[PDB]
Structure 1
Amino acid sequence: EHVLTMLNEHEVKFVDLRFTDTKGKEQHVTIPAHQVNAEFFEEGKMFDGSSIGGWKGINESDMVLMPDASTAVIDPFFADSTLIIRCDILEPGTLQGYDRDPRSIAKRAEDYLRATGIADTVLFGPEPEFFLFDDIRFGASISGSHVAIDDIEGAWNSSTKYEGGNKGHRPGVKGGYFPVPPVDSAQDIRSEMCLVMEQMGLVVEAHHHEVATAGQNEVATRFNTMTKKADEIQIYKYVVHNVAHRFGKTATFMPKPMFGDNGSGMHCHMSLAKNGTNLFSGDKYAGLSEQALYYIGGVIKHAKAINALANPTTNSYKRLVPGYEAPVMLAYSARNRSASIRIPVVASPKARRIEVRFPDPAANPYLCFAALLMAGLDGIKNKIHPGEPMDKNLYDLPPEEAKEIPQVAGSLEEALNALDLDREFLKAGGVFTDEAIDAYIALRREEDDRVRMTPHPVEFELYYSV
């Protein structure tokens, strides 16, 4: 009913139905507002399943788009007044919730949480970073391939001739952390993104330029319950992509667009709760509950499999490389930023939580968050102890005992394989089905293949004169 009044209040002409595919990309279809009736909400609208990658095959194409009336929000970019309504994908007749629908999967995972009685709500606070460029060009054909990035902030443009003169105040390599404008050219745009994000229901905590030259930026938003947060991530990306477009830029959430400067990560802060109390505060290490520790143990035990969802691109592994600040060591600490799991030191026990640092923004919200949870729960159910916190150092020196302690997957294939083998913790509660998992893996292997099979420019530098 709230929806039917929003239609009149904003004189809506269209309703934009949205959903996410397996890869994590928001999709949409539009219907005139006059097509929204009572039926619409109880039985949804029909659409072809076979069209989305990794979904229904040759025989069972048709499926249901079920509008979730709680998600109604006005689109701030479209020319004609239109209302966005996120939808779940349900199996026809049964109206159950498609095994391969990432939002259904995430909901199932929140259900299973309540079911085990371990807690009643999961809290996710992801920190996606991104880049804002002016020009992005790439291609690949039989005779070669290339990628060219360009932005007014790129340090390389210190020598570029410009029509009205080079005004040259640019962030150097790894020198983007906070120079005030004009070095930072994105203040106005970061704020528009903030205002718009809030007009769309998100709550913004801060915004700032990130480390890399050439437009790395970040908008920090307040956490929320798992599934609602993944929804927020999708909106977040949408706002970022579109505000950038409107400003004459182009944004990307790729994890490592440039060799030699910062990649973009999506740290995930998590905590559990029951009847308003934070199940993660306690007397143990850094203010943690023993529940938190088991959770951590779970995440560490299933890290490589989580990688397949939290770092789902070959590019993801160009960020997760033996570097200093590389969040690749499977350990926890409240200081050592070598550890992929940081423990925020905060006063109020109400805010005690863990920060899993290896995820990147390419990750499917839904599936990434879900896999993080399931690993945590399995860590609890099986009281998987974390061991002791690493407070020493990262991957380089150490190099004492060859420092072969836990680490995240080193390639996408490896992560996919881990997901293959270590799938039980995900199938728990019937959240993830084998079919879903196998389909996801197949989609990504096809991607992994393109990169493995196509000659790399660097290979010419290294081996042309062989």
Structure 2
Amino acid sequence: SAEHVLTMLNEHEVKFVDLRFTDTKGKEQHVTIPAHQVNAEFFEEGKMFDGSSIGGWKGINESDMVLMPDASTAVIDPFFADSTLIIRCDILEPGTLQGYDRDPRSIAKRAEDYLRATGIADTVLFGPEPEFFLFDDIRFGASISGSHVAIDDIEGAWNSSTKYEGGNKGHRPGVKGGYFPVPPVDSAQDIRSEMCLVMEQMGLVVEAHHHEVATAGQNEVATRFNTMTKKADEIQIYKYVVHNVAHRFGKTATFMPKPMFGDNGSGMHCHMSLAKNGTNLFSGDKYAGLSEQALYYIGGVIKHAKAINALANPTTNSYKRLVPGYEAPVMLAYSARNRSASIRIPVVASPKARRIEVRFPDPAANPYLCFAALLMAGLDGIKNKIHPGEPMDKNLYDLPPEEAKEIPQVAGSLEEALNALDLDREFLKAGGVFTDEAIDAYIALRREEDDRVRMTPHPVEFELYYSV
């Protein structure tokens, strides 16, 4: 906090302070202030901007907002050359100092408050498992005469034939085979561990690291859960460390859900549970150790899944991952074993660790809005005792049409998720967490992104239709 922060300034001879926050789409933003500009004043009323310059926050008249430093988030940047301290901020409306309707962090905080207000529980626990890719070269573009994307990495199976200037060494993970081969097949041990050390120096707690399924560098660093809002902060720090350590090693990292057709996409499973006075409200006598409270939570998520998709799978690319695969978590059902089920129930020893894992989210999701939406849906399931029906332990739709298998599924496109969010918005507006304008603003930003993809001719359309 304030008192502590002034200490860190001298302990580390800090020269600058990097004010950070997240935009509507979920991208961390920043502005730097010299250390000498930090004072008593600054902490109680923050510093403001010429904001009319950000996206989905742009009001023609009322362009000015306030940056409120959260003294608890203070952490040293491990990359910058001059000693600089990062301080996450909240965006508050001037004078009122209440907390901008469109500020994703404020929204997540409101949802945490509302949890307590309803007395259903006092804390929400989140454990995302975000995956990513490390490449050596990424090129792309689109103009009137065409479009293209070219991915390249030393691990790419396609390079088995490539001439290298010191010789092709040839130990690389094949398609869907990068799982756990030891080095030299796995070329990222040193890279992943650096990411872990740095993540920890930034307040995160690492549980594990490993290469993922896809060829061409899919990797993962598993970090420990935490309270909802703090965890979304951690996700932003996580992405920052990944992006920058990658950069510092001559790589380029991406959190895109599906960079390649034919190999694994990157997902962000979300483990969750509620608690009250140190008791796990999700352990009980019901299915797999679940409380009935947990089942209503599930029911809520299943009822509002398509709307949640607009936040957990916010890109058109997200829908290229959530494609009728067999492992692809698209079926709106729960199970402890079935992998077609978008909600896995971790079979676990201690009741203290009982929870649910919503598998459909991907890393492109704004952690704040996605996490909050998951919660609000779960709470609407509890407030309204929405029974999640029976578990789907049998086997996926590849167990094709048995009754056509008309099991509820996730949105099949962004346009559809956006639609769902438009209509099914009430559960989010509860407790005044999400406002209509906040929701409409979001829908509009994403709608223009969807347009670019729907309007621009796709390379495959030529393969399919040029000789029509």
TM-score category (smaller protein): over 0.9
8 Å CA contact retained: 1:73, 1:83:
yes
What is the TM-score when the length of structure 2 is the normalising length? 0.99
Match of residue 41, structure 2, among 39, 42, 55: 39
CA distance in 2, matches of 1:72, 1:326: 38
Q: Alpha-carbon deviation of 1:51?
A: 1.1
Per-residue CA deviation, residues 59-95 of structure 1 (Å, 9 max, x unaligned), is 0000000000000000000000000000000000000
Q: Alpha-carbon deviation of 1:133?
A: 0.1
Per-residue CA deviation, residues 108-148 of structure 1 (Å, 9 max, x unaligned), is 00000000000000000000000000000000000000000
Q: 5+ unaligned residues in a row in structure 2: which ranges?
A: none
8 Å CA contact retained: 1:171, 1:179:
yes
8 Å CA contact retained: 1:190, 1:219:
yes
8 Å CA contact retained: 1:323, 1:395:
no
CA distance in 2, matches of 1:396, 1:346: 28
CA distance in 2, matches of 1:51, 1:373: 31
Judge which range, 152-161 or 387-396, deviates more: 387-396
CA distance in 2, matches of 1:289, 1:441: 35
Give the superposed CA RMSD.
0.4
Judge which range, 20-29 or 396-405, deviates more: 396-405
Per-residue CA deviation, residues 357-384 of structure 1 (Å, 9 max, x unaligned), is 0000000000000000000000000000
Q: Alpha-carbon deviation of 1:50?
A: 1.4
Q: Alpha-carbon deviation of 1:247?
A: 0.2
CA distance in 2, matches of 1:148, 1:135: 8
**Secondary structure at 2:65 match in 1:** strand
Per-residue CA deviation, residues 231-252 of structure 1 (Å, 9 max, x unaligned), is 0000000000000000000000
CA distance in 2, matches of 1:341, 1:200: 31
Per-residue CA deviation, residues 434-461 of structure 1 (Å, 9 max, x unaligned), is 0000000000000000000000000000
Q: Alpha-carbon deviation of 1:52?
A: 1.0
8 Å CA contact retained: 1:105, 1:431:
yes
CA distance in 2, matches of 1:203, 1:88: 24
How many pairs are equivalent?
466
**Secondary structure at 1:62 match in 2:** coil
Match of residue 307, structure 1, among 300, 309, 313: 309
CA distance in 1, matches of 2:400, 2:211: 31
CA distance in 2, matches of 1:342, 1:128: 16
**Secondary structure at 2:348 match in 1:** coil
CA distance in 2, matches of 1:223, 1:71: 17
Per-residue CA deviation, residues 200-238 of structure 1 (Å, 9 max, x unaligned), is 000000000000000000000000000000000000000
Judge which range, 302-311 or 397-406, deviates more: 397-406
**Secondary structure at 1:164 match in 2:** coil
CA distance in 2, matches of 1:245, 1:289: 45
Q: Alpha-carbon deviation of 1:48?
A: 2.1
Structure 2 counterpart of 1:179:
181
CA distance in 2, matches of 1:398, 1:288: 29
Q: Alpha-carbon deviation of 1:401?
A: 1.2
Structure 2 counterpart of 1:228:
230
Runs of 4+ in 1 over 2 A off after TM superposition: none
Structure 1 counterpart of 2:290:
288
CA distance in 1, matches of 2:244, 2:401: 45
Match of residue 144, structure 1, among 143, 146, 161: 146
Q: Alpha-carbon deviation of 1:57?
A: 1.1
CA distance in 1, matches of 2:166, 2:402: 55
CA distance in 1, matches of 2:50, 2:210: 42
Q: 5+ unaligned residues in a row in structure 1: which ranges?
A: none
CA distance in 2, matches of 1:325, 1:264: 13
User: Percent of pairs identical after alignment?
Assistant: 100
